[PDB]
Amino acid sequence: IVFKVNNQVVSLKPEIIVDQHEYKYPAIKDLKKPCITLGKAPDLNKAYKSVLSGMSAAKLDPDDVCSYLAAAMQFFEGTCPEDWTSYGIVIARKGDKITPGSLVEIKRTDVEGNWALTGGMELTRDPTVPEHASLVGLLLSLYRLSKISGQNTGNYKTNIADRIEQIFETAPFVKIVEHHTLMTTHKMCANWSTIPNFRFLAGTYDMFFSRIEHLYSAIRVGTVVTAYEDCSGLVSFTGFIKQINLTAREAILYFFHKNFEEEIRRMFEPGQETAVPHSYFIHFRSLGLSGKSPYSSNAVGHVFNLIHFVGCYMGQVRSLNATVIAACAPHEMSVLGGYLGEEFFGKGTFERRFFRDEKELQEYEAAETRSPEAVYTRIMMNGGRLKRSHIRRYVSVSSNHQARPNSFAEFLNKTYSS
Amino acid sequence: IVFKVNNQVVSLKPEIIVDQHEYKYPAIKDLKKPCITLGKAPDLNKAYKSVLSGMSAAKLDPDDVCSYLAAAMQFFEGTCPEDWTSYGIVIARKGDKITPGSLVEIKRTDVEGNWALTGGMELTRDPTVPEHASLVGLLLSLYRLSKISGQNTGNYKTNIADRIEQIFETAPFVKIVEHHTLMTTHKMCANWSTIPNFRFLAGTYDMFFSRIEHLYSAIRVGTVVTAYEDCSGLVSFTGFIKQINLTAREAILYFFHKNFEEEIRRMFEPGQETAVPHSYFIHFRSLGLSGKSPYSSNAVGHVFNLIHFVGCYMGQVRSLNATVIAACAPHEMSVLGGYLGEEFFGKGTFERRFFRDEKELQEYEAAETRSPEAVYTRIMMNGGRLKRSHIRRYVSVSSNHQARPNSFAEFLNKTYSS
Amino acid sequence: KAYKSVLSGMSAAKLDPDDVCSYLAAAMQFFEGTCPEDWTSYGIVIARKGDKITPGSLVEIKRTDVEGNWALTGGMELTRDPTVPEHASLVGLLLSLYRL
């Protein structure tokens, strides 16, 4: 922090700025299944009638709903196709029938829930399992609706809600809430996503349904959002590698900036089961074993910006509508993204791979170029400045697109428009 | 100050203009926490029922509301994660639970509050902590809403208030008011932001919740405005360096003007803990000890204008909507900003940082220009006159934007339009 | 405080019988006057000429250590402590409910 200002005599002043985060990682050393604390065990059918009436009445108690969802986990059971171990060995083994309760630890206290029958809706007999499944799915789907809040998302929320309702009103599920009840409860239950126990249970359900196929696997439609939650950065990177046809290692070579270093270390920390198909990691944020995610689009802001800027240059709609992380030097990211997209748009690395004869193969072996070094030199020659063609492509993509409020498309349009 | 005029003889006249501002800095030399006086501790049940009736009836008493919040701030307690030292006060010890009351001293007075009931409510029993916290948040949110008042605010005030209602009607908070009750009280509390004690406590709450995570941390939505309040110049400087991807020191070198000197010294004056993350500095304006902020946009106007002018050149929407400081030579700032924006727009400093094998670093180690000097020379060559291309860029940005009343966008459109 | 509670309850059209009764018994001290002549109600000297008496002086009221809720339910606009008339007007309106 060196600086010199000149008054009548020369004076020196230092600058001061503050930035720091924690970024705790998910792997657990104690090997203790995620734990949630809930109330006294529910009265079976009585908890079902209270919450269903509450649904039609759009009044629900969070603690009671959580206890009902924990009890309903015993209803859903399936045989495990393969032996299952995540972090400390999971108990599930090949061919073993399991419940969702087996995946996480649920802790119950002496205090009993209100289980009140707020709605005038009445059920003469004890409910059947499908009815229970239909309610569990409808309750879980509120979580998804709670997450999808934002500008101009009204018609879209209703469309997903209608899809949710038709799934749970048709077999193997039975219609228990008629129509439009799901939207009205969501109006009163818009911030239910913030509730920790509700998120914990949704993640548990999604983990169980992903591994074990079930008749009521359609319940996952509410809980799909829990998978890879707050890991968009990592998710964007893995797609970027696949779309670009790079080996991931090679892809990092193209990241020519000092800022990427911290992010690359952040997302690739060892010991986290980023490498296991059905591990706790996929639902780590939803489950208790989490912190602010080091894999979020903000935690890896520069890499995320670069990825979608390249995506925009290649016309990837997902990138066009993703929201840019404004803090992480988007302009520099766009320039580098411009060059990388130029390299990757409309070009492929093709080589003859299939031959009629081994001799033919050997002859082909006896016999402008895509490399990180070539790209870096090209950037260096133009002084780290975008080419006119980069700008034209960017503008052509952005303008012929319905630019969303804070999307990359909007950033491109506002930035390069003449 | 010499002037000579000839009116049938030689005449000498002096010219005098007045220009002085105190710009006092926040002092922690007294080693005493900030203090306010308030009325006698209210009846827990009566204060809650009175304010709730008042809210539905849009009638609120400021001294009564302030004492109730001061009573409820004792309820909020949490453990301190790490050792917490203010600038001259040891505010906390690591592993010691603390309250907002531990942050600042409030002195009670023999004057009792009226706690009168404006309309009838259903509640007849003593209130629980959640109810108390839900009301505290709704009351604190009025402060943000009064600040939000201004000349063309569409329905932005209404939507932000709707969010506040949702926060405090969902768990861990309990719903105490029907929807839109906050909007009606806000109409009566449009200038509630001016009240000093209400300002002081809102800052106290925000500081406490920022250091210590709490179940009721969502109360910060009202008090978030107190953070870095009236320090927009400093905040704009920090964003400018990060977006521009330069170090604070390197960035100030490009500021080629005499006027900047006083402002730079003023905002980087030593003895203020800007670098400390949870220092008193972050909420100093809300608590007190500063009649006028030296880090306010007006105090550091020349810097402020140059920063957003560069942002407009780069198409940053925040800069486009920021209100220009007319006094601090905006035209001259815009010219420097055109050149500075020219240097930083569409250009990035790229270096290879990732290589395949350890051997590759040594190979890469074996070996226009972005510098303050090059820009300064480029300006001197054009004699301090904006290039035509600079004017076009400014014009292209302003015309394709919904220019707000006194915004930088409006200044650009009005200044350079043919 | 009791006057404010019952007045709010009156306005809220919801009244708690126990607090209403305690308020009326408490308010009995406000109404006092000298007895014109010697008073023998039923072999008991309730009053003597020139002796100041209240409704409380006629019947002994037993108060238990247990206190009532005296809660605020309805709209009461008094920002100040109530005056004696104010006390008497409420006592009359409450007592008139019996006749209704």
PDB file of N, CA, C and O in Angstrom, chain B residues 338-393:
ATOM      1  N   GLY B 338     -13.661   9.252 -19.914  1.00  0.00           N
ATOM      2  CA  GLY B 338     -13.637   8.719 -21.262  1.00  0.00           C
ATOM      3  C   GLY B 338     -12.314   8.055 -21.589  1.00  0.00           C
ATOM      4  O   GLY B 338     -12.282   6.941 -22.123  1.00  0.00           O
ATOM      5  N   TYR B 339     -11.201   8.724 -21.247  1.00  0.00           N
ATOM      6  CA  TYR B 339      -9.877   8.149 -21.486  1.00  0.00           C
ATOM      7  C   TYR B 339      -9.648   6.925 -20.612  1.00  0.00           C
ATOM      8  O   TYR B 339      -9.175   5.890 -21.100  1.00  0.00           O
ATOM      9  N   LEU B 340      -9.986   7.024 -19.321  1.00  0.00           N
ATOM     10  CA  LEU B 340      -9.802   5.887 -18.424  1.00  0.00           C
ATOM     11  C   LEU B 340     -10.689   4.730 -18.848  1.00  0.00           C
ATOM     12  O   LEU B 340     -10.250   3.576 -18.876  1.00  0.00           O
ATOM     13  N   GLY B 341     -11.939   5.030 -19.190  1.00  0.00           N
ATOM     14  CA  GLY B 341     -12.823   3.999 -19.687  1.00  0.00           C
ATOM     15  C   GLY B 341     -12.315   3.391 -20.975  1.00  0.00           C
ATOM     16  O   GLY B 341     -12.413   2.181 -21.177  1.00  0.00           O
ATOM     17  N   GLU B 342     -11.727   4.214 -21.847  1.00  0.00           N
ATOM     18  CA  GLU B 342     -11.154   3.683 -23.083  1.00  0.00           C
ATOM     19  C   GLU B 342     -10.076   2.643 -22.786  1.00  0.00           C
ATOM     20  O   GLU B 342     -10.021   1.597 -23.442  1.00  0.00           O
ATOM     21  N   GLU B 343      -9.211   2.920 -21.799  1.00  0.00           N
ATOM     22  CA  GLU B 343      -8.130   2.002 -21.426  1.00  0.00           C
ATOM     23  C   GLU B 343      -8.644   0.684 -20.855  1.00  0.00           C
ATOM     24  O   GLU B 343      -8.005  -0.366 -21.033  1.00  0.00           O
ATOM     25  N   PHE B 344      -9.720   0.733 -20.064  1.00  0.00           N
ATOM     26  CA  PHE B 344     -10.225  -0.447 -19.373  1.00  0.00           C
ATOM     27  C   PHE B 344     -11.399  -1.148 -20.055  1.00  0.00           C
ATOM     28  O   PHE B 344     -11.804  -2.213 -19.590  1.00  0.00           O
ATOM     29  N   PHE B 345     -11.975  -0.584 -21.107  1.00  0.00           N
ATOM     30  CA  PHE B 345     -13.133  -1.183 -21.764  1.00  0.00           C
ATOM     31  C   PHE B 345     -12.688  -2.072 -22.910  1.00  0.00           C
ATOM     32  O   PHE B 345     -12.074  -1.590 -23.869  1.00  0.00           O
ATOM     33  N   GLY B 346     -13.057  -3.351 -22.847  1.00  0.00           N
ATOM     34  CA  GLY B 346     -12.731  -4.295 -23.904  1.00  0.00           C
ATOM     35  C   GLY B 346     -11.314  -4.824 -23.883  1.00  0.00           C
ATOM     36  O   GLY B 346     -10.911  -5.532 -24.819  1.00  0.00           O
ATOM     37  N   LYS B 347     -10.565  -4.544 -22.820  1.00  0.00           N
ATOM     38  CA  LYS B 347      -9.169  -4.920 -22.709  1.00  0.00           C
ATOM     39  C   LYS B 347      -8.970  -5.601 -21.367  1.00  0.00           C
ATOM     40  O   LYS B 347      -9.575  -5.212 -20.365  1.00  0.00           O
ATOM     41  N   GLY B 348      -8.132  -6.623 -21.360  1.00  0.00           N
ATOM     42  CA  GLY B 348      -7.789  -7.296 -20.126  1.00  0.00           C
ATOM     43  C   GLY B 348      -6.329  -7.680 -20.137  1.00  0.00           C
ATOM     44  O   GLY B 348      -5.749  -7.973 -21.185  1.00  0.00           O
ATOM     45  N   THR B 349      -5.756  -7.737 -18.939  1.00  0.00           N
ATOM     46  CA  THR B 349      -4.372  -8.138 -18.747  1.00  0.00           C
ATOM     47  C   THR B 349      -4.377  -9.626 -18.463  1.00  0.00           C
ATOM     48  O   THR B 349      -4.773 -10.052 -17.376  1.00  0.00           O
ATOM     49  N   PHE B 350      -3.936 -10.416 -19.429  1.00  0.00           N
ATOM     50  CA  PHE B 350      -3.999 -11.864 -19.330  1.00  0.00           C
ATOM     51  C   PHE B 350      -2.596 -12.448 -19.273  1.00  0.00           C
ATOM     52  O   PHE B 350      -1.711 -12.038 -20.030  1.00  0.00           O
ATOM     53  N   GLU B 351      -2.404 -13.413 -18.375  1.00  0.00           N
ATOM     54  CA  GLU B 351      -1.140 -14.123 -18.230  1.00  0.00           C
ATOM     55  C   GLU B 351      -1.460 -15.582 -17.968  1.00  0.00           C
ATOM     56  O   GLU B 351      -2.445 -15.888 -17.294  1.00  0.00           O
ATOM     57  N   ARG B 352      -0.644 -16.484 -18.505  1.00  0.00           N
ATOM     58  CA  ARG B 352      -0.861 -17.895 -18.225  1.00  0.00           C
ATOM     59  C   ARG B 352      -0.524 -18.191 -16.768  1.00  0.00           C
ATOM     60  O   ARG B 352       0.549 -17.831 -16.287  1.00  0.00           O
ATOM     61  N   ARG B 353      -1.442 -18.818 -16.047  1.00  0.00           N
ATOM     62  CA  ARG B 353      -1.153 -19.173 -14.676  1.00  0.00           C
ATOM     63  C   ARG B 353      -1.212 -20.670 -14.442  1.00  0.00           C
ATOM     64  O   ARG B 353      -0.752 -21.127 -13.386  1.00  0.00           O
ATOM     65  N   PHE B 354      -1.763 -21.444 -15.383  1.00  0.00           N
ATOM     66  CA  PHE B 354      -1.932 -22.889 -15.234  1.00  0.00           C
ATOM     67  C   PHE B 354      -1.202 -23.632 -16.341  1.00  0.00           C
ATOM     68  O   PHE B 354      -1.452 -23.370 -17.522  1.00  0.00           O
ATOM     69  N   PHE B 355      -0.378 -24.619 -15.970  1.00  0.00           N
ATOM     70  CA  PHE B 355       0.403 -25.391 -16.938  1.00  0.00           C
ATOM     71  C   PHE B 355       0.313 -26.879 -16.611  1.00  0.00           C
ATOM     72  O   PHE B 355       0.005 -27.268 -15.481  1.00  0.00           O
ATOM     73  N   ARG B 356       0.574 -27.723 -17.620  1.00  0.00           N
ATOM     74  CA  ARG B 356       0.322 -29.160 -17.459  1.00  0.00           C
ATOM     75  C   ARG B 356       1.237 -29.847 -16.447  1.00  0.00           C
ATOM     76  O   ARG B 356       0.771 -30.710 -15.697  1.00  0.00           O
ATOM     77  N   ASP B 357       2.544 -29.575 -16.473  1.00  0.00           N
ATOM     78  CA  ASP B 357       3.507 -30.253 -15.603  1.00  0.00           C
ATOM     79  C   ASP B 357       4.495 -29.247 -15.023  1.00  0.00           C
ATOM     80  O   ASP B 357       4.777 -28.216 -15.640  1.00  0.00           O
ATOM     81  N   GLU B 358       5.133 -29.624 -13.902  1.00  0.00           N
ATOM     82  CA  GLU B 358       6.066 -28.720 -13.220  1.00  0.00           C
ATOM     83  C   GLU B 358       7.108 -28.208 -14.181  1.00  0.00           C
ATOM     84  O   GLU B 358       7.566 -27.062 -14.070  1.00  0.00           O
ATOM     85  N   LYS B 359       7.484 -29.047 -15.140  1.00  0.00           N
ATOM     86  CA  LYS B 359       8.459 -28.624 -16.123  1.00  0.00           C
ATOM     87  C   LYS B 359       7.950 -27.425 -16.920  1.00  0.00           C
ATOM     88  O   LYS B 359       8.705 -26.475 -17.172  1.00  0.00           O
ATOM     89  N   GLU B 360       6.653 -27.398 -17.237  1.00  0.00           N
ATOM     90  CA  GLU B 360       6.136 -26.316 -18.069  1.00  0.00           C
ATOM     91  C   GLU B 360       6.310 -24.922 -17.437  1.00  0.00           C
ATOM     92  O   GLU B 360       6.490 -23.962 -18.186  1.00  0.00           O
ATOM     93  N   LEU B 361       6.265 -24.776 -16.101  1.00  0.00           N
ATOM     94  CA  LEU B 361       6.506 -23.450 -15.530  1.00  0.00           C
ATOM     95  C   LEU B 361       7.888 -22.916 -15.857  1.00  0.00           C
ATOM     96  O   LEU B 361       8.022 -21.714 -16.129  1.00  0.00           O
ATOM     97  N   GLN B 362       8.935 -23.740 -15.741  1.00  0.00           N
ATOM     98  CA  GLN B 362      10.257 -23.218 -16.039  1.00  0.00           C
ATOM     99  C   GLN B 362      10.323 -22.795 -17.487  1.00  0.00           C
ATOM    100  O   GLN B 362      10.873 -21.733 -17.782  1.00  0.00           O
ATOM    101  N   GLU B 363       9.696 -23.569 -18.386  1.00  0.00           N
ATOM    102  CA  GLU B 363       9.710 -23.203 -19.796  1.00  0.00           C
ATOM    103  C   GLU B 363       8.981 -21.882 -20.018  1.00  0.00           C
ATOM    104  O   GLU B 363       9.457 -21.021 -20.772  1.00  0.00           O
ATOM    105  N   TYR B 364       7.826 -21.697 -19.364  1.00  0.00           N
ATOM    106  CA  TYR B 364       7.117 -20.424 -19.467  1.00  0.00           C
ATOM    107  C   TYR B 364       7.861 -19.311 -18.743  1.00  0.00           C
ATOM    108  O   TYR B 364       7.680 -18.132 -19.068  1.00  0.00           O
ATOM    109  N   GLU B 365       8.718 -19.651 -17.781  1.00  0.00           N
ATOM    110  CA  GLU B 365       9.420 -18.589 -17.075  1.00  0.00           C
ATOM    111  C   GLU B 365      10.465 -17.950 -17.975  1.00  0.00           C
ATOM    112  O   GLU B 365      10.761 -16.758 -17.830  1.00  0.00           O
ATOM    113  N   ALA B 366      10.993 -18.711 -18.931  1.00  0.00           N
ATOM    114  CA  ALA B 366      11.949 -18.172 -19.888  1.00  0.00           C
ATOM    115  C   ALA B 366      11.235 -17.209 -20.839  1.00  0.00           C
ATOM    116  O   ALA B 366      10.232 -17.574 -21.461  1.00  0.00           O
ATOM    117  N   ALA B 367      11.712 -15.960 -20.901  1.00  0.00           N
ATOM    118  CA  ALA B 367      11.151 -14.953 -21.812  1.00  0.00           C
ATOM    119  C   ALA B 367      12.217 -14.451 -22.818  1.00  0.00           C
ATOM    120  O   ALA B 367      12.587 -13.270 -22.858  1.00  0.00           O
ATOM    121  N   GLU B 368      -1.919  -0.564 -26.317  1.00  0.00           N
ATOM    122  CA  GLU B 368      -0.637  -1.236 -26.124  1.00  0.00           C
ATOM    123  C   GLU B 368      -0.436  -1.645 -24.678  1.00  0.00           C
ATOM    124  O   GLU B 368      -1.115  -2.552 -24.181  1.00  0.00           O
ATOM    125  N   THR B 369       0.425  -0.903 -23.982  1.00  0.00           N
ATOM    126  CA  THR B 369       0.758  -1.212 -22.599  1.00  0.00           C
ATOM    127  C   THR B 369      -0.196  -0.498 -21.649  1.00  0.00           C
ATOM    128  O   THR B 369      -0.565   0.659 -21.866  1.00  0.00           O
ATOM    129  N   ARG B 370      -0.640  -1.211 -20.622  1.00  0.00           N
ATOM    130  CA  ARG B 370      -1.564  -0.646 -19.649  1.00  0.00           C
ATOM    131  C   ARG B 370      -0.722  -0.026 -18.537  1.00  0.00           C
ATOM    132  O   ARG B 370      -0.165  -0.737 -17.691  1.00  0.00           O
ATOM    133  N   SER B 371      -0.655   1.303 -18.522  1.00  0.00           N
ATOM    134  CA  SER B 371       0.130   2.021 -17.536  1.00  0.00           C
ATOM    135  C   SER B 371      -0.478   3.392 -17.341  1.00  0.00           C
ATOM    136  O   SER B 371      -1.044   3.953 -18.286  1.00  0.00           O
ATOM    137  N   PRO B 372      -0.343   3.977 -16.151  1.00  0.00           N
ATOM    138  CA  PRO B 372      -0.810   5.360 -15.980  1.00  0.00           C
ATOM    139  C   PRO B 372      -0.125   6.324 -16.925  1.00  0.00           C
ATOM    140  O   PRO B 372      -0.745   7.269 -17.430  1.00  0.00           O
ATOM    141  N   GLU B 373       1.159   6.115 -17.157  1.00  0.00           N
ATOM    142  CA  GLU B 373       1.917   7.035 -17.986  1.00  0.00           C
ATOM    143  C   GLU B 373       1.381   7.056 -19.416  1.00  0.00           C
ATOM    144  O   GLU B 373       1.204   8.130 -20.008  1.00  0.00           O
ATOM    145  N   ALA B 374       1.069   5.878 -19.970  1.00  0.00           N
ATOM    146  CA  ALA B 374       0.610   5.814 -21.357  1.00  0.00           C
ATOM    147  C   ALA B 374      -0.705   6.564 -21.533  1.00  0.00           C
ATOM    148  O   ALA B 374      -0.900   7.273 -22.530  1.00  0.00           O
ATOM    149  N   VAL B 375      -1.626   6.405 -20.586  1.00  0.00           N
ATOM    150  CA  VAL B 375      -2.879   7.137 -20.662  1.00  0.00           C
ATOM    151  C   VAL B 375      -2.614   8.630 -20.558  1.00  0.00           C
ATOM    152  O   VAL B 375      -3.032   9.406 -21.430  1.00  0.00           O
ATOM    153  N   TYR B 376      -1.780   9.035 -19.590  1.00  0.00           N
ATOM    154  CA  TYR B 376      -1.545  10.462 -19.388  1.00  0.00           C
ATOM    155  C   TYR B 376      -0.950  11.089 -20.643  1.00  0.00           C
ATOM    156  O   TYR B 376      -1.365  12.173 -21.067  1.00  0.00           O
ATOM    157  N   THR B 377       0.003  10.404 -21.267  1.00  0.00           N
ATOM    158  CA  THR B 377       0.546  10.890 -22.526  1.00  0.00           C
ATOM    159  C   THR B 377      -0.518  10.936 -23.618  1.00  0.00           C
ATOM    160  O   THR B 377      -0.581  11.902 -24.386  1.00  0.00           O
ATOM    161  N   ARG B 378      -1.398   9.933 -23.668  1.00  0.00           N
ATOM    162  CA  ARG B 378      -2.451   9.915 -24.680  1.00  0.00           C
ATOM    163  C   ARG B 378      -3.373  11.119 -24.530  1.00  0.00           C
ATOM    164  O   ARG B 378      -3.918  11.620 -25.525  1.00  0.00           O
ATOM    165  N   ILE B 379      -3.672  11.493 -23.275  1.00  0.00           N
ATOM    166  CA  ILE B 379      -4.454  12.700 -22.994  1.00  0.00           C
ATOM    167  C   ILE B 379      -3.698  13.947 -23.442  1.00  0.00           C
ATOM    168  O   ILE B 379      -4.264  14.821 -24.109  1.00  0.00           O
ATOM    169  N   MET B 380      -2.397  14.023 -23.138  1.00  0.00           N
ATOM    170  CA  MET B 380      -1.638  15.223 -23.480  1.00  0.00           C
ATOM    171  C   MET B 380      -1.589  15.420 -24.980  1.00  0.00           C
ATOM    172  O   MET B 380      -1.704  16.554 -25.465  1.00  0.00           O
ATOM    173  N   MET B 381      -1.489  14.316 -25.732  1.00  0.00           N
ATOM    174  CA  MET B 381      -1.440  14.403 -27.192  1.00  0.00           C
ATOM    175  C   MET B 381      -2.713  15.027 -27.758  1.00  0.00           C
ATOM    176  O   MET B 381      -2.652  15.800 -28.720  1.00  0.00           O
ATOM    177  N   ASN B 382      -3.881  14.695 -27.193  1.00  0.00           N
ATOM    178  CA  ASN B 382      -5.123  15.299 -27.658  1.00  0.00           C
ATOM    179  C   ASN B 382      -5.462  16.564 -26.887  1.00  0.00           C
ATOM    180  O   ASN B 382      -6.610  17.022 -26.961  1.00  0.00           O
ATOM    181  N   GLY B 383      -4.525  17.068 -26.080  1.00  0.00           N
ATOM    182  CA  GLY B 383      -4.677  18.332 -25.375  1.00  0.00           C
ATOM    183  C   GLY B 383      -5.770  18.388 -24.328  1.00  0.00           C
ATOM    184  O   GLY B 383      -6.254  19.484 -24.012  1.00  0.00           O
ATOM    185  N   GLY B 384      -6.102  17.250 -23.716  1.00  0.00           N
ATOM    186  CA  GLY B 384      -7.193  17.151 -22.758  1.00  0.00           C
ATOM    187  C   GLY B 384      -8.560  17.237 -23.376  1.00  0.00           C
ATOM    188  O   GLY B 384      -9.516  17.589 -22.687  1.00  0.00           O
ATOM    189  N   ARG B 385      -8.684  16.902 -24.659  1.00  0.00           N
ATOM    190  CA  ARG B 385      -9.947  17.002 -25.366  1.00  0.00           C
ATOM    191  C   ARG B 385     -10.434  15.591 -25.660  1.00  0.00           C
ATOM    192  O   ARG B 385      -9.664  14.758 -26.152  1.00  0.00           O
ATOM    193  N   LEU B 386     -11.723  15.349 -25.406  1.00  0.00           N
ATOM    194  CA  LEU B 386     -12.301  14.030 -25.614  1.00  0.00           C
ATOM    195  C   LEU B 386     -12.149  13.648 -27.079  1.00  0.00           C
ATOM    196  O   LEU B 386     -12.237  14.503 -27.960  1.00  0.00           O
ATOM    197  N   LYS B 387     -11.832  12.385 -27.348  1.00  0.00           N
ATOM    198  CA  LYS B 387     -11.802  11.962 -28.739  1.00  0.00           C
ATOM    199  C   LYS B 387     -13.236  11.855 -29.244  1.00  0.00           C
ATOM    200  O   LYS B 387     -14.179  11.680 -28.465  1.00  0.00           O
ATOM    201  N   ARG B 388     -13.406  11.945 -30.560  1.00  0.00           N
ATOM    202  CA  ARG B 388     -14.755  11.795 -31.090  1.00  0.00           C
ATOM    203  C   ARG B 388     -15.325  10.432 -30.727  1.00  0.00           C
ATOM    204  O   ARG B 388     -16.479  10.330 -30.291  1.00  0.00           O
ATOM    205  N   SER B 389     -14.489   9.391 -30.785  1.00  0.00           N
ATOM    206  CA  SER B 389     -14.948   8.046 -30.457  1.00  0.00           C
ATOM    207  C   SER B 389     -15.435   7.952 -29.011  1.00  0.00           C
ATOM    208  O   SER B 389     -16.444   7.288 -28.735  1.00  0.00           O
ATOM    209  N   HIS B 390     -14.756   8.637 -28.083  1.00  0.00           N
ATOM    210  CA  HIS B 390     -15.229   8.680 -26.703  1.00  0.00           C
ATOM    211  C   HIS B 390     -16.635   9.245 -26.642  1.00  0.00           C
ATOM    212  O   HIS B 390     -17.499   8.719 -25.930  1.00  0.00           O
ATOM    213  N   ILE B 391     -16.884  10.325 -27.380  1.00  0.00           N
ATOM    214  CA  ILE B 391     -18.201  10.938 -27.322  1.00  0.00           C
ATOM    215  C   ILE B 391     -19.242   9.979 -27.870  1.00  0.00           C
ATOM    216  O   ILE B 391     -20.296   9.779 -27.257  1.00  0.00           O
ATOM    217  N   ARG B 392     -18.929   9.299 -28.977  1.00  0.00           N
ATOM    218  CA  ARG B 392     -19.881   8.347 -29.541  1.00  0.00           C
ATOM    219  C   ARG B 392     -20.249   7.272 -28.522  1.00  0.00           C
ATOM    220  O   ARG B 392     -21.438   6.996 -28.300  1.00  0.00           O
ATOM    221  N   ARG B 393     -19.247   6.716 -27.834  1.00  0.00           N
ATOM    222  CA  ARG B 393     -19.506   5.667 -26.853  1.00  0.00           C
ATOM    223  C   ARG B 393     -20.433   6.175 -25.768  1.00  0.00           C
ATOM    224  O   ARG B 393     -21.492   5.587 -25.526  1.00  0.00           O
TER     225      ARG B 393
END
